[model samples]
Target: GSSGSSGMASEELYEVERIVDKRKNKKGKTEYLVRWKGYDSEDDTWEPEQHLVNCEEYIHDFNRRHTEKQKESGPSSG
Candidate 1:
């Protein structure tokens, strides 16, 4: 197996299925839930948005969907 830039063994599935979900903490940094291609839910992981900055389409679509869902849920009290 090829080694990644991290000098670690690369992920067996080089492809990702999609960004299944995301969450923003009080600090405002977003965490993206990545579902790897050919992997099951148990294998999915949450990665910082910074780690996925290169995936523009994923970020855009996820934000779009999340925005709609937030509109439906209405505002929440702090």
Candidate 2:
């Protein structure tokens, strides 16, 4: 076996695939279901919003959709 061909491994940063859902934990803090890239459904974890600053796009997307759904389902101001 060579000492320099395939023996080197690079550290890959965790990539967020998409946000599954959001909820408030027992501590009344917001947490989001982080679907990690290259991971399965079972590997998804509920992470706090502060730890997910890297996934701003996914976070904002989910929140916007949430509000939209609530607005459509709630009473409207006519």
Candidate 3:
């Protein structure tokens, strides 16, 4: 059986910030942390600055992927 494609949960609405650490062996890879908008999360959030080195590139790629996803979905009425 084929699994149906599911969209992102409607409840999950927070901007994502990609954190990259170039000092580590894995340079170009990126990790993400949620800004949570005005809301707060129970878990501790990872600060992007703390994971610098390749921070700029990580953020750039993150934004690029986000924009691409939004474009694919077009505009949401809600």
Candidate 4:
């Protein structure tokens, strides 16, 4: 489990506005654009790597399921 460089913990807690799924890559990595608890969108869209660190287990499980699904789907078109 590789940890992100971003440091965890902050004086402020952000609220999850909506989750974004950036599937541009093959792995289909996802990022959450959270709205700071008291801040508006104009302030910043905090993509907290540290917050994602806590979800390592879930991420691993998701990858595992993805691989399984891929296997079940068979080979891709050339």
Candidate number achieving the greatest TM-score relative to the actual structure: 2
User: Which RMSD does model 3 reach against the true structure?
Assistant: 11.2
- Which pairs of residues collide in model 2? none
Ranking by TM-score: 2, 1, 4, 3
| C-alpha lDDT of candidate 4 relative to the true structure | 0.46
Candidate 2 accuracy as lDDT:
0.75
Over the full model, what C-alpha lDDT does candidate 3 score relative to the true structure? 0.45
Estimate every model's Cα lDDT from 0 to 1: 0.69, 0.75, 0.45, 0.46
TM-score of 1: 0.55
Better of 3 and 4 by lDDT: 4
Off by over 4 Å in 3: 1-44, 48-54, 69-78
Instruction: Score residue 29 of candidate 3 by CA lDDT.
Output: 41
Candidate 4's displacement at residue 72, Å, is 15
For each candidate, give its TM-score against the true structure.
0.55, 0.63, 0.26, 0.28
For residues 1-78, write the lDDT of model 1, one tens digit per residue: 232233354764354447888888678888888887656898888877787755666667677777755434446565
User: How would you order the candidates by lDDT, starting with the best?
Assistant: 2, 1, 4, 3
Q: Where does candidate 1 clash, by residue pair?
A: none
For candidate 3, lDDT tens digit of each residue in 1-78?
Answer: 242343675774343443322122255444455344554554525544444433455555556665655534456566
**lDDT tens digits, residues 22-69, model 2?**
899998999999887766898788888988865787788778877755
Name the weakest run of 10 consecutive residues (lDDT summed) in model 3: 16-25
